[PDB]
Design an enzyme around this catalytic site. Structure first.
Site, PDB file in Angstrom:
ATOM      1  CG  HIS A  44     204.741 101.604  40.996  1.00 40.38           C
ATOM      2  ND1 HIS A  44     205.631 100.700  41.534  1.00 40.38           N
ATOM      3  CD2 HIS A  44     203.918 101.106  40.292  1.00 40.38           C
ATOM      4  CE1 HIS A  44     204.880  99.384  41.352  1.00 40.38           C
ATOM      5  NE2 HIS A  44     203.964  99.845  40.619  1.00 40.38           N
ATOM      6  CG  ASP A  93     207.404 101.476  44.342  1.00 33.93           C
ATOM      7  OD1 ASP A  93     206.531 102.252  44.531  1.00 33.93           O
ATOM      8  OD2 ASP A  93     207.371 100.333  43.716  1.00 33.93           O
ATOM      9  N   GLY A 186     199.936  94.847  37.004  1.00 36.81           N
ATOM     10  CA  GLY A 186     198.718  94.715  37.947  1.00 36.81           C
ATOM     11  C   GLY A 186     198.765  94.263  39.226  1.00 36.81           C
ATOM     12  CB  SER A 188     202.916  97.220  41.513  1.00 36.07           C
ATOM     13  OG  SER A 188     201.698  97.952  40.799  1.00 36.07           O
ATOM     14  N   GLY A 189     201.866  96.916  44.431  1.00 38.51           N
ATOM     15  CA  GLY A 189     201.076  97.524  45.728  1.00 38.51           C
ATOM     16  C   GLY A 189     200.581  96.546  46.475  1.00 38.51           C
TER      17      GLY A 189
HETATM   18  N1  LIG Z   1     193.548  97.931  34.685  1.00 35.76           N
HETATM   19  C1  LIG Z   1     194.715  97.467  34.232  1.00 35.76           C
HETATM   20  N2  LIG Z   1     194.823  97.023  33.085  1.00 35.76           N
HETATM   21  N3  LIG Z   1     196.093  96.970  32.686  1.00 35.76           N
HETATM   22  C2  LIG Z   1     196.845  97.298  33.692  1.00 35.76           C
HETATM   23  C3  LIG Z   1     198.178  97.330  33.879  1.00 35.76           C
HETATM   24  C4  LIG Z   1     198.768  97.661  35.151  1.00 35.76           C
HETATM   25  C5  LIG Z   1     200.141  97.686  35.327  1.00 35.76           C
HETATM   26  N4  LIG Z   1     200.743  97.820  36.337  1.00 35.76           N
HETATM   27  C6  LIG Z   1     201.958  98.036  36.301  1.00 35.76           C
HETATM   28  C7  LIG Z   1     202.806  98.216  37.509  1.00 35.76           C
HETATM   29  N5  LIG Z   1     203.932  97.193  37.955  1.00 35.76           N
HETATM   30  C8  LIG Z   1     203.449  95.911  38.258  1.00 35.76           C
HETATM   31  O1  LIG Z   1     201.999  95.874  38.588  1.00 35.76           O
HETATM   32  C9  LIG Z   1     204.355  94.727  38.679  1.00 35.76           C
HETATM   33  C10 LIG Z   1     205.495  94.666  38.004  1.00 35.76           C
HETATM   34  C11 LIG Z   1     206.251  93.497  38.422  1.00 35.76           C
HETATM   35  C12 LIG Z   1     206.354  93.319  39.397  1.00 35.76           C
HETATM   36  C13 LIG Z   1     207.560  92.153  40.119  1.00 35.76           C
HETATM   37 CL1  LIG Z   1     207.748  91.744  41.446  1.00 35.76          CL
HETATM   38  C14 LIG Z   1     207.771  91.437  39.062  1.00 35.76           C
HETATM   39  C15 LIG Z   1     207.809  91.645  37.755  1.00 35.76           C
HETATM   40  C16 LIG Z   1     207.083  92.756  37.381  1.00 35.76           C
HETATM   41  N6  LIG Z   1     206.721  93.148  36.156  1.00 35.76           N
HETATM   42  C17 LIG Z   1     205.540  93.525  35.403  1.00 35.76           C
HETATM   43  N7  LIG Z   1     205.871  93.716  34.250  1.00 35.76           N
HETATM   44  N8  LIG Z   1     207.195  93.690  33.842  1.00 35.76           N
HETATM   45  N9  LIG Z   1     207.694  93.525  35.060  1.00 35.76           N
HETATM   46  N10 LIG Z   1     202.359  98.116  35.189  1.00 35.76           N
HETATM   47  C18 LIG Z   1     201.136  97.999  34.475  1.00 35.76           C
HETATM   48 CL2  LIG Z   1     201.165  98.122  32.593  1.00 35.76          CL
HETATM   49  C19 LIG Z   1     197.774  98.334  36.072  1.00 35.76           C
HETATM   50  C20 LIG Z   1     196.423  98.285  35.933  1.00 35.76           C
HETATM   51  C21 LIG Z   1     195.985  97.637  34.849  1.00 35.76           C
END
Ligand SMILES: Nc1n[nH]c2cc(-c3[nH]c(CNC(=O)/C=C/c4cc(Cl)ccc4-n4cnnn4)nc3Cl)ccc12
Length: 237
Positions: A44, A93, A186, A188-189
């Site tokens: 993702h 994923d 942030g 994830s991965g």
């Molecule tokens: N430079 C940046 N500034 N802001 C950012 C936001 C993101 C970003 N990544 C993601 C993808 N998901 C994740 O990283 C993890 C999710 C996640 C994983 C688990 Cl195990 C449990 C709960 C989770 N939850 C998180 N939020 N609701 N559930 N969404 C966003 Cl928004 C990436 C980079 C930057």
């Protein structure tokens, strides 16, 4: 990471920060070193990534603030996304990054082992999630790599908390019944790393959850052991 603490330099040497540079440079996702030319991360992460040309892999980083215009990074030669991947919550994923050159391993940049052949029925009791993600749903990327210990839950318990989703054998869940520690935006991965007989194994890849650190809503991770054949096929091609 919600409810975590700051790591120290060299503590999680397989952890990388994957940056995008389009339209500006920022942390996109975590990842894990699994070979001298190979990062394992989440599919993702590449939503809206136009090509590998805009990616930078940084290893040996504790603080995002360490990264400047002369900080060394690895280019990405190829992104290999699982061919069945559609969206995080539906599974598959998982992605490999083939680097343009080989990591010389050092104290600050080390591989993590995959879950080992013969260990399919090991009960992991020492598992940690790490990353630079948010400390709550509306936050920002953290400067210092954070860590949290989180217990695995059974797939049966996890499915009962996510009755709107198909929780499969290719997922693994981790969380406290009362919440308070979890991955968040942030993270994830990055890895869910579990220590067994004093050897770290990459048991999960941070994938998704409903909110962050809520009661009775475990985080959901890609179950790496169920992708070992896929990884070995792609890294031996
Ligand atoms: N430079 C940046 N500034 N802001 C950012 C936001 C993101 C970003 N990544 C993601 C993808 N998901 C994740 O990283 C993890 C999710 C996640 C994983 C688990 Cl195990 C449990 C709960 C989770 N939850 C998180 N939020 N609701 N559930 N969404 C966003 Cl928004 C990436 C980079 C930057």
């Amino acid at each position: 990471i919600v409810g975590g603490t700051a790591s120290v330099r060299g503590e999680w040497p397989w952890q990388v920060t994957l940056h995008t540079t389009s339209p500006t440079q920022r942390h996109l996702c975590g990842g894990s070193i699994i070979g001298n030319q190979w990062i394992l991360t989440a599919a993702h992460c590449f939503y809206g990534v136009e090509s590998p040309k805009i990616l930078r892999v940084y290893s040996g980083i504790l603080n995002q603030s360490e990264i400047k215009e002369d900080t060394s990074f690895f280019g990405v030669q190829e992104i290999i996304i699982h061919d069945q991947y559609k969206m995080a919550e539906s599974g598959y994923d998982i992605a490999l990054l083939k680097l343009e050159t080989t990591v010389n391993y050092t104290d600050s940049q080390r591989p993590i082992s995959l879950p080992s052949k013969g260990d399919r029925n090991v009960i992991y009791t020492d598992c940690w999630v790490t990353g630079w993600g948010y400390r709550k749903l509306r936050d920002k990327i953290q400067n210092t790599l954070q860590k949290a210990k989180i217990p695995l839950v059974t797939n049966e318990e996890c499915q009962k908390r996510y009755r709107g989703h198909k929780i499969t054998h290719k997922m693994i869940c981790a969380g406290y019944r009362e919440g308070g520690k979890d991955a968040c935006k942030g993270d994830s991965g990055g890895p869910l790393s579990c220590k067994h007989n004093e050897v770290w194994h990459l048991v999960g890849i941070t994938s998704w959850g409903e909110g962050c650190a809520q009661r009775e809503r475990p985080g959901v991770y890609t179950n790496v052991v169920e992708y070992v054949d896929w990884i070995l096929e792609k890294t031996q091609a």
